Every structure is written in structure tokens, then in C-alpha cells.
Amino acid sequence: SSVPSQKTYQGSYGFRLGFLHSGTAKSVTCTYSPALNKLFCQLAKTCPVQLWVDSTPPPGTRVRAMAIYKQSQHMTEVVRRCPHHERCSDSDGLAPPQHLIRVEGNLRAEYLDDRNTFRHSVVVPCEPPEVGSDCTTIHYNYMCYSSCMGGMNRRPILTIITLEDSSGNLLGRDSFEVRVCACPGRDRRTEEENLRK
Ligand SMILES: CCn1c2ccc(CNC)cc2c2ccc(-c3cscn3)cc21
Numbered sequence: 283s284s285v286p287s288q289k290t291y292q293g294s295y296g297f298r299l300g301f302l303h304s305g306t307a308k309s310v311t312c313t314y315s316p317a318l319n320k321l322f323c324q325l326a327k328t329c330p331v332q333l334w335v336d337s338t339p340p341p342g343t344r345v346r347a348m349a350i351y352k353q354s355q356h357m358t359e360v361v362r363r364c365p366h367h368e369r370c371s372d373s374d375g376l377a378p379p380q381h382l383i384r385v386e387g388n389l390r391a392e393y394l395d396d397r398n399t400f401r402h403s404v405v406v407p408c409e410p411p412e413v414g415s416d417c418t419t420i421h422y423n424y425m426c427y428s429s430c431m432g433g434m435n436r437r438p439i440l441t442i443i444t445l446e447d448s449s450g451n452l453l454g455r456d457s458f459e460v461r462v463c464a465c466p467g468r469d470r471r472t473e474e475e476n477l478r479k
């Protein structure tokens with residue numbers, strides 16, 4: 283399959299992501315490394331991702347998430363759930379069981395199987411922040427481990443977040459690496475130490 287672009291693009295509205303500062307304690311379930319541009323999270327746990335813009339986008343703007351493999355020798359392979367997890371009937375009623383990325387708690391989430399690339403994505407309406415908040419947060423879930431045999435099988439992935447107009451045209455783009463693992467705090471600490479070395 284052809285490879286969706288991962289080029290960072292703020293666009294007319296100044297679109298970019300933001301992440302909480304959750305730390306690296308052994309008990310943490312989701313933590314983001316700015317130095318690695320990498321999110322570490324446990325299986326199927328809530329991953330808050332912030333959306334930031336400098337100016338107000340039009341009604342009908344949407345926000346899409348898609349995963350691709352990071353390594354060039356694997357980027358043409360569709361990222362999907364492994365043969366076990368696609369069959370474990372953990373459906374939320376909306377997400378197809380094959381999809382790695384879900385949006386949590388948004389009844390207007392839509393899930394796409396691309397008719398030409400066969401790639402999976404989940405898209406929601408772009409919404410302004412809640413009254414009293416400075417940004418909008420989407421809660422994502424990753425539904426396989428990076429290590430799952432027959433699926434990602436230890437290959438690193440990226441999530442690409444695109445801001446789109448109502449036709450699906452590109453307005454903005456950002457991305458981050460993801461590792462779905464049992465101990466995100468320890469793994470973030472290890473990889474940041476490896477980077478320092
Ligand atoms: C991207 C999320 N977001 C913000 C994040 C951050 C900010 C900046 N707050 C200091 C504003 C917005 C914002 C405004 C409007 C809309 C909107 C209108 S009609 C559809 N979507 C969305 C907004």
C-alpha cells in the first residue's frame with residue numbers, strides 16, 4: 283500500500299498536538315516523551331491527546347487518526363490488530379474489531395476502511411474547548427501490544443493526526459511514535475537513557 287504522508291504541517295489554523303506531563307513512575311499507564319516524540323501506553327488504556335490551534339477552524343472540520351509502520355521496510359504494510367485481538371470480541375459497538383486505534387467516549391466517531399489502501403482510521407468532529415479550558419482533548423485507545431505476534435510483532439508505529447475539512451482535504455498534520463507495552467514508565471525511562479547515550 284502507498285504510504286500516507288507524515289510531514290508536520292501546521293496549516294492556516296496553526297494546528298498541532300499537545301501531551302500531558304504524566305511522568306515515568308512504574309504505575310503510569312500513558313506517558314509522552316518529548317525528546318523521543320513518542321507515546322508509551324498500556325493496552326487499551328486511555329491516551330489523552332490535546333489539539334491546539336491559533337485560530338478557529340470552520341464548522342465541519344474533522345480530526346483523523348491513522349497508524350503506519352515507522353521503518354521504511356514495513357511502511358507499506360497496513361497496521362492492524364493481531365489475529366488474537368481482532369477476535370476477542372472487545373467491541374465498543376462502533377469500532378471494527380480489526381482497528382488498532384479507537385476513540386474513547388465519542389458517539390460521533392467514524393471508522394474508515396480505505397477502499398484503495400485498505401488502511402484503517404478513526405475520525406471525529408473537531409470541537410472547541412470546553413468552557414474554561416484552553417484546548418480540546420481526544421481520548422485514544424491502542425488495542426494491541428507493539429509486541430503482538432502476527433500483528434505489529436515488535437515493529438514501531440507512528441500515529442498520524444490530520445485536521446481535515448468536511449470533504450477530507452488536508453488542513454493540518456502532526457504525528458508521534460507509539461509503543462504499546464506493559465510498563466510505559468520504565469520503557470520511556472530506558473529509551474530516553476538510550477538516547478542520552
Ligand atoms: C482544535 C480544537 N480547538 C482549539 C484548541 C485550542 C484553542 C486555543 N485556546 C487558547 C482553540 C481551539 C478551537 C476553537 C474552535 C474550534 C472549532 C470550531 S468549529 C470546530 N472546531 C476548535 C478549537
Ligand SMILES: [Zn+2]
Nearest residue numbers: 364367426430
Ligand atoms: Zn494483539
